[PDB]
Amino acid sequence: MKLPVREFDAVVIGAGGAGMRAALQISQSGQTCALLSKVFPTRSHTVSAQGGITVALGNTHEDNWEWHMYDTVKGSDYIGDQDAIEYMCKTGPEAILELEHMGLPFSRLDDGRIYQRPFGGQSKNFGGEQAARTAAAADRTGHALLHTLYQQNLKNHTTIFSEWYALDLVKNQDGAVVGCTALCIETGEVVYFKARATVLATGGAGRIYQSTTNAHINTGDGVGMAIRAGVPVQDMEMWQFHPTGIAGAGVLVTEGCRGEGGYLLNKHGERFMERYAPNAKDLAGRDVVARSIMIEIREGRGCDGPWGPHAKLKLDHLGKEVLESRLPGILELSRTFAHVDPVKEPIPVIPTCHYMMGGIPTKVTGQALTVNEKGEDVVVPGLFAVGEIACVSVHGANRLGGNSLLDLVVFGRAAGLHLQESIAEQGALRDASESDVEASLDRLNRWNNNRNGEDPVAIRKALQECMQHNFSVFREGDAMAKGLEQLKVIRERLKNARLDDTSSEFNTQRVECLELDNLMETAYATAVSANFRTESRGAHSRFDFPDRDDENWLCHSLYLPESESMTRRSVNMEPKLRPAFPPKIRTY
Amino acid sequence: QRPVNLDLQTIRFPITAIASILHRVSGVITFVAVGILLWLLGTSLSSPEGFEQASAIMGSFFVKFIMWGILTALAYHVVVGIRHMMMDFGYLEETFEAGKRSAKISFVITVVLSLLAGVLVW
């Protein structure tokens, strides 16, 4: 070894909600743990979460986790693993109450209990009356959650490597993941983080698009690292476009706006969601609401102005008091990025890339999965994944609002609780050779040695425009085929991209160049998968295949990196505590 | 070793910050001023001759200016000092607006006392 080796029981790549909850549990279980993050932990995208955490506490009204499971299963359009969803909704309450005991500043009901607001895809009695089970701290829940978790990691004395950048996973000759190489952003030092368990918690990748609600740091590094390591990704074509991103800015305004009583209007002042979704109205599934808005615009009923084509989100009727109390966050966002005061005027909104439903296939234990030559599932020894980088899958083809933060906590904790048994199950892993570690640096070495190559900025903007045009809310065969070919060309330009900053002391250019590789891998996997699934399910909508096909496509899509081809995995439909919810027609 | 940005000339300072740094300065000056006031007092009380001598010193224009400065610095320290104690006891709000407003009022009150100090010295 001519490279510093830092050995730990577990190496958690990512300090978001999922990463910090996992690190917390792993440490308390008696194992050493290194928490990596390319930004200061509290700068993670989780910090921007607004709405809250969907969980069946039963505070606002008598609730049932089975009701929550139903809403989730239906919401995922029936490709969400029901055994995993069952675990999440059942375990939810305890896991969330645990956060409150950590000091999380939840909003409060008059009786002192945690405040719960209505949200999209929430009903009582299995598809009945509207429900309200999204626990929230105003509309800064993500902020409250993340900081509380960081505070808990401080109290726990967790070993945190802040502003370190994971490059690539390290594999031994047996094909097992035995850690990863990382770049210290401050000094430029490259180190091999050796571990018996490498937990990917790197978040989403909304930045593969021209317009997204995601932070600049959401570049899908986890997806890229997985793909380059031979690990398959799942349901990458399932991209959730949040109905209400600020038109012309992309900045998100919480679905809590509609959960508190706000509704959408077109240029004619019609509350059009009553037409598209007679029952749930403005609180229908996000995939449905997003399309409804785009149909209004596409047919000339959308509003225009400085912000560009959009729909109006009316909130003023709620009153100054309720707005400033329950939704102060969106008041500042709207006034700042839209120059609109929600207390007096509707907010200009338009569907914006928001959440990645796809990712690395995992068991409830967090263990990463791949498939053998027979198509059978086999665990990837040493590799794990939690959060938005994972595809459990508990969200299927459409995630419910508030289910992500729940996902982070429940499965981040799950990975921690079952880490010891997972490590014993996988057995001792053979040491990585000096060439094994060296292979993980090939991608870094290329940048460092490329001076006269192409301008990466042009490559990034071309990539984002391709995804925006050909893989947005509405898709079609012809457009996706061309988008795929364009990506192949763009991917070739990237192989000869240049790094104009060669310094080592906090060189952000090198970081963003390395991130670009991951944007490419994520974008390509998404494209190939989109073309693959010839049907319309959840957020995936094709004009050439407008119907949902339960005979041919009641399953997950799987992108195989080594053959750059597609295959399929079974959707789990065998809950342990109740019968499975059978696939039926999905309307709101 | 690493450099730090602490070039005071490149930084904005609100009226509250100016008022604060002046209160510290006025405090230091008053510390030296006490000794000078005591030295003067001791002379004016030792004998009938010492008093006339003290009067003559107060006649000097250069001494008149300095004496005015001492009284001005003292006046400021007292007024702004009370401003402080009024916030400590809740008589003044601790908002930025209240901070500005009380600071400006402190300056005005000080200017008035500075003039009355001038009258007392002519």
Partner: protein, 238 residues
Amino acid sequence: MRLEFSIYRYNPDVDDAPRMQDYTLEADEGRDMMLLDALIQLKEKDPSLSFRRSCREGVCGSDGLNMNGKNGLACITPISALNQPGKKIVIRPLPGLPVIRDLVVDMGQFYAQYEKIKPYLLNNGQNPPAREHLQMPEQREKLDGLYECILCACCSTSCPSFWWNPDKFIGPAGLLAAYRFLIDSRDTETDSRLDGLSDAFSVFRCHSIMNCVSVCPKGLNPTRAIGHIKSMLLQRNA
């Protein structure tokens, strides 16, 4: 229209000392972008320009900068609020902290003070709740204006007291956090926390300079919080 910048530059492997570099950026005449928008575009022409950023919506607290002499967030500071006919838009790092590279400062000491006040719920365990701790809306409202802190360090890096004793004075942000737990009805170690804040530096280095309040991007008021802490210290140790 044309925009002119004067930006703080430093690279330990190249620069003998810090320096200011002139930047020009053609902007859309009838479009008002944020400072962060400009910085990102400047990096497109000069890839060597280093600075922190992430959420670009004023929540994460990554891009705290000294703009035209005053601290704030680049992501929510409009170019129109900085642009003055004849003068360059001056961009410098947050004052007081060691400069790692260009506009990036070492927040070590800032985090250190944050940890010193033990920023985590301390509940003795007695009288445990059936489910979640019961906190009335009245009690919960005491946390408003305190828990919203994004740890951007705009306040502390503008406080002279923090400049002179960054290792002893907790600073605006840290003290805001301390009070955040001091008045949390769920925290049971109020007396213990106060006993660790009775020295001459921790809290009493604050002299109501009020640089903290004016710069806070979230509109928080560290001065009032510190004021409350002082009262509690008196009620207990006077």
